[PDB]
A = this chain, B = another copy of it.
Amino acid sequence: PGKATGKGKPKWLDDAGKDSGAPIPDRIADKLRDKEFKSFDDFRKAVWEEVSKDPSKLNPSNKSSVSKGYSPFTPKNQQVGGRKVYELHADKPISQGGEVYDMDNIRVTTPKRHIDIHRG
């Protein structure tokens, strides 16, 4: 069990397909900061509810997805195998053993990008 820290930074999702991904925006950072979380999808289910309700809004199927706490589908050429959505990526392995959800470290990436980061 762990909790969320950090400030994130001010589509941003068009950036998700290169470099280290996109940052967790400040407003979302502000809303999750200090919340304890049982597991990794619990934290991820919190992040995406936040994109929806923050008018950063996403085609109809994508707006519906995030509203229920699902990552939105990436473009076809950015998906890989069964991975069709945006993924949360730790820029460094510093989760302090899954005790921290450092929202300055955590980034948003396409599957293609995220695999290319860790290697491919």
Chain A residues in contact with chain B, CB under 8 A? 2, 40-41, 44, 70-71, 80-85, 89-90, 92-95, 98, 112, 115-120
Contacts and interface: CB of A to CB of B under 8 A. Distances in A.
Contacts of A84: 82
A84 B90 CA distance: 20
**In the assembly, how many copies of this chain are there?**
2
25 contacts: A2-B120, A40-B80, A40-B112, A40-B115, A40-B120, A41-B80, A44-B80, A44-B81, A70-B82, A71-B81, A71-B82, A82-B83, A82-B84, A82-B85, A90-B118, A90-B119, A90-B120, A93-B118, A93-B119, A94-B119, A95-B119, A98-B116, A98-B119, A98-B120, A118-B118
A111 to B, nearest CB: 9
Contacts of A70: 81-82
A89 to B, nearest CB: 7
A120 to B, nearest CB: 5
A113 B94 CA distance: 16
A29 B101 CA distance: 37
Nearest to A117: B93
Nearest to A71: B81
